[PDB]
């Protein structure tokens, strides 16, 4: 499924500017820089006070649509996190950030997470030398995420990594631009993520 | 402060009935079907009570005196008309403390009408108002006689009969105001924070206790005053 369709309509509906196209969510064309109201005929109408279920559902949908993960995998990851020992929310975030497509996005190989998903699915990304084409692949601390030597001549990779010159990466990631590779140093802490999501709201949403 | 043996007429409590079991600790015995207060525990509690009074008085605190028993009205109306502690004489109005702002508005109207009877505006707006406002000021002075002195909530209250003035006691409890009271056998001692186990019906008991109390108050602020002119109220 992947929800495939319009994306900046989610930038609008969630009320917070999402980055689903990569660029053009930074340019004054996101339709969130110019139309902050939700979509539809009744978008500009006066909003009613949302229910608690409304708030929690909206927050969970925000966090889920940020990564482009389906409801099945999302709920599975959440239950897996709740099984583990430790804070459920931070562990859930560390799991979501450990996905191979999300790591490719975070490493600047792709401008958006969906472009990263296509880069992974088409076998343009390697993990520790071996080719991996699964976005749901979980990256462990220490894994080297590289670009396939046969794909290092593609125009899109050249562009993205030519733009990554001078850009910094997340505190839990290392990047080598000449070799077109990187390393997942550790799991990201809650303070390392600047996501506009309250994890406790999602925990309470699934607590029902 | 020298009332050791002079306690003549204070030990007489109420009858066998109309008492409160919680008062049994302050009772000596029962002579001829009348509870008699324990003389020792009287001064025992008087030490602590008068000590609290001295502490609160030398700090500049205000104490509200509440008397309505018709046997202590004429006494409170002057023992508080001494050192400027306010008083309530005719009847205790519901809300004088918890609704203190509205009663203070009534006091504002009182001083407003006092100002109108001081200005030449008495003659304008003819005799109809000159009688209405006259009776209004009359009753405002009748009820808010001593209460007009309270600019803010008091720092303590003094009650002559906590059973007759139970509403004032409750209102003081609600606002965490210390409650000093001259309790008798017909009252609950737990509600009183500083108890004075004496008689509330006789005039000599009230006169003695309140005279010595106001004397201790003025002594805590220096300038010992002459004996209070409340003896002539024996009649």
């Amino acid at each position: 499924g992947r929800y495939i369709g319009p994306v900046c309509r989610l930038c609008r509906r969630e009320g917070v500017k999402l980055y689903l196209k990569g660029e053009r969510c930074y340019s004054p064309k996101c339709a969130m820089e110019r139309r902050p109201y939700p979509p539809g005929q009744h978008g500009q109408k006066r909003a009613r006070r949302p229910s608690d279920y409304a708030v929690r559902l909206r927050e969970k949908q925000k966090l889920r649509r940020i990564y482009g993960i389906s409801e099945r995998q999302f709920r599975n990851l959440f239950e897996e996190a709740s099984k583990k020992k430790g804070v459920t929310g931070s562990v859930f975030l560390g799991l979501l950030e450990s996905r191979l497509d999300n790591v490719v996005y975070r490493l600047g190989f792709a401008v958006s997470r969906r472009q990263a998903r296509q880069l992974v699915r088409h076998g343009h990304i390697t993990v520790n030398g071996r080719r991996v084409d699964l976005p749901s692949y979980r990256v462990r601390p220490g894994d080297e995420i590289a670009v396939a030597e046969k794909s290092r001549n593609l125009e899109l990779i050249r562009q993205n990594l030519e733009a990554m010159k001078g850009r910094k990466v997340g505190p839990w990631l290392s990047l080598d631009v000449e070799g077109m590779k990187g390393k997942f140093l550790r799991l990201p802490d809650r303070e390392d993520l600047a996501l506009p999501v309250n994890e406790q709201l999602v925990i309470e949403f699934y607590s029902r | 402060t020298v009332k050791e043996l002079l306690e003549a007429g204070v030990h007489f409590g109420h009858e066998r009935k109309r008492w409160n079991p919680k008062f049994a600790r302050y009772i000596y015995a029962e002579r001829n079907g009348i509870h008699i207060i324990d003389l020792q525990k009287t001064m025992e509690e008087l030490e602590r009570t008068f000590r609290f009074i001295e502490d609160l008085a030398m700090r500049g605190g205000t104490i509200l005196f509440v008397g309505t028993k018709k046997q202590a009205q004429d006494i409170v109306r002057m023992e508080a008309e001494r050192a400027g502690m306010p008083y309530v004489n005719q009847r205790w109005l519901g809300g004088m403390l918890t609704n203190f702002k509205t009663i203070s508005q009534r006091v504002h109207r009182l001083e407003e009408l006092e100002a109108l009877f001081a200005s030449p505006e008495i003659e304008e707006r003819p005799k109809k108002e000159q009688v209405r406002l006259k009776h209004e000021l009359e009753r405002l002075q009748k009820y808010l006689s001593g209460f007009r002195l309270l600019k803010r909530l008091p720092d303590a209250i003094f009650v002559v009969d906590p059973t007759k003035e139970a509403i004032a006691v409750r209102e003081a409890r609600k606002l965490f105001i210390p409650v000093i009271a001259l309790a008798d056998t017909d009252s609950d001692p737990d509600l009183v924070d500083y108890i004075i186990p004496g008689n509330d019906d006789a005039i000599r008991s009230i006169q003695l206790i309140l005279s010595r109390a106001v004397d201790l108050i003025i002594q805590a602020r220096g300038g010992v005053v002459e004996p209070s002119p409340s003896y002539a109220l024996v009649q």
């Binding site: 608690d52 430790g86 804070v87 459920t88 929310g89 931070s90 406790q200 309470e204 607590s207 | -």
Partner: protein
């Protein structure tokens, strides 16, 4: 400085010759999320006045909560009327698990992880009062050893 959230708003009716006449009641919790909470029930002919009055009443009725690392020091069980509230401390990373009313009250108190259960009457007013009395009946180890000095 003080967060204010309404629990429920209801419209009551009294009968008068001619028809029914409406009066609005509202519950309001106020908390600093530091350990102080407050519950208030306001009534007024209109809704906003009722909410404001409930806020005033709630600020006038405060409760100091002895939090111990975002949770409660010991499990409690309070009957208010026919309503029963059951509270139980939880390890961090649990979250507040409660009905709407106790969740709001505890969240404004600064609680982060706790387990609750409403029993008997589910009445929001009585459940709120039971939660308040539960928070009021909480004792710290310091308070316990203070009561047993002798």
């Amino acid at each position: 400085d003080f967060e204010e959230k309404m629990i429920l708003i209801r419209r009551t009716a009294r009968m008068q010759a001619g028809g029914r006449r409406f009066r609005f009641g509202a519950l309001v919790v106020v908390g600093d999320r530091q350990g102080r909470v407050g519950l208030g029930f306001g009534k007024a002919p209109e809704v906003p006045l009722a909410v404001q009055k409930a806020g005033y009443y709630a600020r006038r009725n405060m409760v100091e909560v002895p939090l111990q690392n975002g949770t409660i020091p010991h499990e409690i069980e309070v009957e208010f009327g026919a309503s029963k509230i059951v509270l139980k401390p939880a390890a961090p990373g649990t979250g507040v698990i409660a009905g709407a009313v106790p969740r709001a009250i505890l969240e404004l108190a600064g609680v982060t992880d706790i387990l609750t259960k409403e029993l008997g009457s589910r009445n929001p007013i009585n459940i709120a009062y039971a939660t308040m009395e539960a928070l009021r009946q909480l004792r710290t180890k310091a308070d316990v050893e203070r009561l047993r000095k002798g």
